[PDB]
Amino acid sequence: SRAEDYEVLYTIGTGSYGRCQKIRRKSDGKILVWKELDYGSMTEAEKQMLVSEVNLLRELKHPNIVRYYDRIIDRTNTTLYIVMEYCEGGDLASVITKGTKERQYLDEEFVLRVMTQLTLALKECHRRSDGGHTVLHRDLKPANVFLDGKQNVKLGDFVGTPYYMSPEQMNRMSYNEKSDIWSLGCLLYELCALMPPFTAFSQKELAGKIREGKFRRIPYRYSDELNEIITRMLNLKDYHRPSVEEILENPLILEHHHHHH
Ligand SMILES: NS(=O)(=O)c1ccc(Nc2nc(OCC3CCCCC3)c3nc[nH]c3n2)cc1
């Protein structure tokens, strides 16, 4: 309930909401992280915006969703502390970087686990169980996808260039569930090719490439089937993209893909 109940270990990275640090829970020694939100400049109706969102996401529970643990207010530091599961295996962006450095494509099996488990995660957001929510992730990219010790997927974190900008957002249309699917298509594509499906140096020529909807096949190392389903998420028409259910129906997706390395 208070900062005193936790001991900061060190500081990881600083993302959107603010700083993110690894921590030990005083009472039993569990390693975790939390995320700072300085609320010190917010109003009392800018705040009301945050608190409903924070509660919505707090109810989200899934083995491939980063687990919520605690919230903490600190008037002194005017900071809101959201405490969450620590993800030992880092993020997929590092995995992609590593593939690039080593010049080694990832196994189709590893891509199939990631696709399967992010799809289960998004399904719990989009549908799910019972349940009220309907949540869209709205920021699906490798830096927001973490791995545990057995490299299982944890979906987290609900001037640069927006490679994964969907065709809806780019044509003034509201972000919908199929926009999550486009983002997943970009991520899986980049996971295979070790580069995103549309590259460019200016945003206006990236927008142009995205509008035409054309890109390289993922490497030949990968099956026609995997290329097909990823390509399907990159349909320009959102109603031509698979839903999370259609994805999971794919013959490629098997039981062993749902858990551990
Ligand atoms: N770079 S790295 O490869 O060395 C490595 C990376 C991340 C982690 N672990 C980890 N990180 C998080 O966010 C850190 C990250 C989140 C997005 C914004 C910037 C900061 C988490 N949020 C919940 N659980 C989290 N777990 C371990 C090693």
Residues 120 and 151: their CA atoms lie apart, in Å, by 16
Our mutation pick for probing the ligand 1 site, out of 91, 139, 155, counting the most ligand atoms within 8 A of Cβ, is 91
- 33: nearest Cα among 60, 54, 6: 6
Question: Tokens 């390289």 label which residue?
Answer: 216
Read out DSSP for 99-112?
HHHHT-PPPHHHHH
Our mutation pick for probing the ligand 1 site, out of 64, 67, 87, 88, counting the most ligand atoms within 8 A of Cβ, is 87
Residues 142 and 193: their CA atoms lie apart, in Å, by 13
Task: Find out if CATH 1.10.510.10 is the number for domain 47-66+88-261.
Answer: yes
CA distances from 92 to 110, 187, 245 (A): 11, 9, 23
* Domain limits, the chain: 1-46+67-87, 47-66+88-261
Residues 6+ apart with CB under 8 A from 61: 67, 68, 124
Strands 31-38 and 79-85 turn out to be: antiparallel
Binding site for ATP: which residues? 12-20, 35
Residues 6+ apart with CB under 8 A from 166: 175, 179, 182, 183, 238
Query: Is 5 labeled as catalytic in the residue annotation?
Result: no
- Residue ranges around ligand 1 (CB below 6 Å): 12-13, 15, 20, 33, 66, 84-87, 90-91, 94, 143, 146, 156-157
CB 168 within 8 A of CB 238: yes
H/E stretch holding 154: strand 153-155
Please give the distance, rounded to the nearest whole angstrom, from the Cα atom of residue 136 to the centre of ligand 1.
21
Please give the distance, rounded to the nearest whole angstrom, from the Cα atom of residue 243 to the centre of ligand 1.
28
Read out DSSP for 12-48?
EEE-SSSEEEEEEETTT--EEEEEEEE-TT--SSSHH
CB 69 within 8 A of CB 85: yes
Residues 6+ apart with CB under 8 A from 79: 36, 37, 38, 39, 40, 73
Selecting among 28, 38, 74, 139, the annotated active-site residue is 139
**Protein residue whose Cα sits closest to atom 26 of ligand 1:** 87
Phi first, then psi, for residue 31 (nearest 5°) are -80, 135
Please give the distance, rounded to the nearest whole angstrom, from the Cα atom of residue 215 to the centre of ligand 1.
30
Task: Find out if CATH 3.30.200.20 is the number for domain 1-46+67-87.
Answer: yes
Tokens of 198: 């549309």
- Name the experimental technique: X-ray
Question: Tokens 């594509």 label which residue?
Answer: 189
**Protein residue whose Cα sits closest to atom 8 of ligand 1:** 90
CB 97 within 8 A of CB 52: no
Instruction: Give the number of other Cβ atoms within 10 Å of residue 40's Cβ.
Output: 10
Q: Using N-to-C axis directions, what is the helix angle for 177-193 and 108-126, rounded to 10°?
A: 170
- 138: nearest Cα among 115, 117, 157, 160: 157
Q: Using N-to-C axis directions, what is the helix angle for 177-193 and 224-233, rounded to 10°?
A: 140
Residues 147 and 156: their CA atoms lie apart, in Å, by 10
Strands 68-74 and 31-38 turn out to be: unpaired
Resolution (angstroms) equals 2.3
Strands 31-38 and 6-14 turn out to be: unpaired
Phi first, then psi, for residue 37 (nearest 5°) are -125, 105
Phi first, then psi, for residue 234 (nearest 5°) are -100, 20
- The amino acid occupying position 256 is H
- The amino acid occupying position 83 is V
H/E stretch holding 147: strand 145-147
Long-range contacts from 221-224, C-beta under 8 angstroms, 24+ separation: 221/105, 221/108, 221/192, 222/108, 222/111, 222/192, 223/108, 223/252
Residues 255 and 73: their CA atoms lie apart, in Å, by 42
Helices (H), 40-176: 47-58, 92-102, 108-126
